[PDB]
Amino acid sequence: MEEAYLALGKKILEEGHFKEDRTGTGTYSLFGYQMRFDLAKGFPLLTTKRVPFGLIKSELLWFLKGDTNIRYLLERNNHIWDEWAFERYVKSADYQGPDMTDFGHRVLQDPAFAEQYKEEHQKFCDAILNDAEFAEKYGELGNIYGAQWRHWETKDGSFIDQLANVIEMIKTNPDSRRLIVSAWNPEDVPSMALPPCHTMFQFYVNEGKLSCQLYQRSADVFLGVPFNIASYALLTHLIAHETGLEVGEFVHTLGDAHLYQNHVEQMQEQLSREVRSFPTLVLNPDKASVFDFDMEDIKVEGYDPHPTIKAPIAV
Amino acid sequence: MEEAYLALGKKILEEGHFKEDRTGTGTYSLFGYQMRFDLAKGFPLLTTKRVPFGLIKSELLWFLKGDTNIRYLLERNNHIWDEWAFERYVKSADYQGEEHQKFCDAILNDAEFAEKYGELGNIYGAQWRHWETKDGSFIDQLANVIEMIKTNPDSRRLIVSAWNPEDVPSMALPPCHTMFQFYVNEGKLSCQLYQRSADVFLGVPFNIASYALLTHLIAHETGLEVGEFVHTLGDAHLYQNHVEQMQEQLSREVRSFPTLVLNPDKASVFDFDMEDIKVEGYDPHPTIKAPI
Ligand SMILES: Nc1nc2c(c(=O)[nH]1)N(C=O)[C@@H](CNc1ccc(C(=O)N[C@@H](CCC(=O)O)C(=O)O)cc1)CN2
Ligand SMILES: O=c1[nH]c(=O)n([C@H]2C[C@H](O)[C@@H](COP(=O)(O)O)O2)cc1F
């Protein structure tokens, strides 16, 4: 239910402990939460604020083809991953622009500096889009989601195709209590841009409906969780389609759920708006496998949200 | 609360989905479930039925010490993990086929026999303290995370995983307790356990006590107060011939939990033994016997 996501946000606002975080921004936070979304009751794309389904749609596609380089996201005009690639870049020997230490916060503080940033980030983007060698070096975020989903590296010079394996298991072994996918690779976690927040997920089959639980170690509640919800609903639907099942529930389970302190006002304005109907998701029936979908194959129809509420992303 | 666990047994009898499998076992289950235990209210040993604290503490001390060999467990009268060890020996070259008591004695007295026959391969001890990397190294998750709590309490990365997709397809007993996360605030240590598969009458009691004990041990080691243990379930199943038991348990009135007393004259929990963990004021209802 939309109300479930809203109730969490309210609860964090109302009874969240204040907490310093890796980004030095400041958060309000709980530990341990669970919300359920019945997918039969609408595709859970938030209606109390416009959420851009395109960006969700193309980040997931990016996950599904194993890709960890942001060039693909740039091609489809998705900048939601840029900052971490930009951070790697500025901190390398190859960057000789103006100083960028702590840019996450400084572009909020100083307007002149935000022009300096706006420029350098632009150049970064264009370099990624056009120089292949640059792209190869500075578009790469490490063995994040696509790598662990598609290409978990084995001790003996090979790789496990975790997503595929589990889709196949749904088909032949639906009562399996082992239908798990993990992004959490201890080996790789030091070398990733950010260790997987949406960390592990598990599937369940009952009476011809597929349900999914995701275990999220860390949830940015205003900016993060709207995306994640929609992302995992999509994936459940796409897997349903393949495996010929109907949709069950998404269960979203959180460790540290938190509100960035400069999202407090946004969440407040969000909380005063009236919930509307979730839209309907329509898939292209011609496409056979989860790995076969492209962006024009997934649409959400009947989506009438309240206006965008903008907020700054904590780097 | 204890009543949080009892809600789950009740919900499964009320609305759990029945499933019969390739082995013939019937189960009523649900999918996705969160319980909370505030450990300042008392250590979560179920009062509605005796839960034996001896085996849980030997098992968890075994897990914490990296051990994957049953010698330790045997020294302490914990037989939980005999079976795969005795199976392998009965198939081995030096057997001349009452006999389980002679294997056990072998494991206890002959050091050479043990480093050969009491060894289980990939289990919690291996997963928590010895995750093999590609090059041949090993990662000590539990350790690093202990270090992480000390130096960086605010970290959102306080994770231990027992789930390796390379290892799972070939392992006899893939891990039920799939991963868990620590979180620190206001000097209190909390723990959430994601568990992919849950035996509600039999497993879940044992489970709640193990992870609460760990939360206390880690707490004690990093010098902190305990907070909550949050228990999250994937597929949570009541076995078809545990139903009458569950009904009997649901009649009994709830009593206050006991109080965990740890021994203060020992600094590291890495030198903890059975005598350093005791439970005071434990007053449960009688055991409810039930087929494993
Ligand atoms: N602090 C933080 N870091 C994170 C995440 C996060 O949610 N929070 N992520 C979580 O996945 C990843 C990146 N995901 C993101 C998801 C949404 C937006 C975002 O800014 N959405 C806006 C902008 C949309 C637009 O401009 O068109 C919005 O909807 O307001 C950014 C990153 C990795 N790092
Ligand atoms: O899928 C994701 N969802 C999400 O909410 N984050 C957010 C959560 C948190 O605000 C930050 C991660 O920082 P840390 O690793 O320090 O928790 O990114 C990241 C992802 F990759």
Author numbering:
A (entry chain B): 1 to 315
B (entry chain A): 1 to 97, 119 to 313
Task: List sentences quoted exactly from the publication behind this structure.
Thymidylate synthase (TS, EC 2.1.1.45) is a ubiquitous enzyme that catalyzes the reductive methylation of 2′-deoxyuridine-5′-monophosphate (dUMP) to 2′-deoxythymidyne-5′-monophosphate (dTMP) using N5,N10-methylenetetrahydrofolate (mTHF) as a cofactor. In cells, TS provides the only synthetic source of dTMP necessary for DNA biosynthesis. TS works as an obligate homodimer, having residues from both enzyme subunits that contribute to substrate binding in each catalytic site. TS subunits are characterized by two domains, known as large and small domains (LD and SD, respectively).
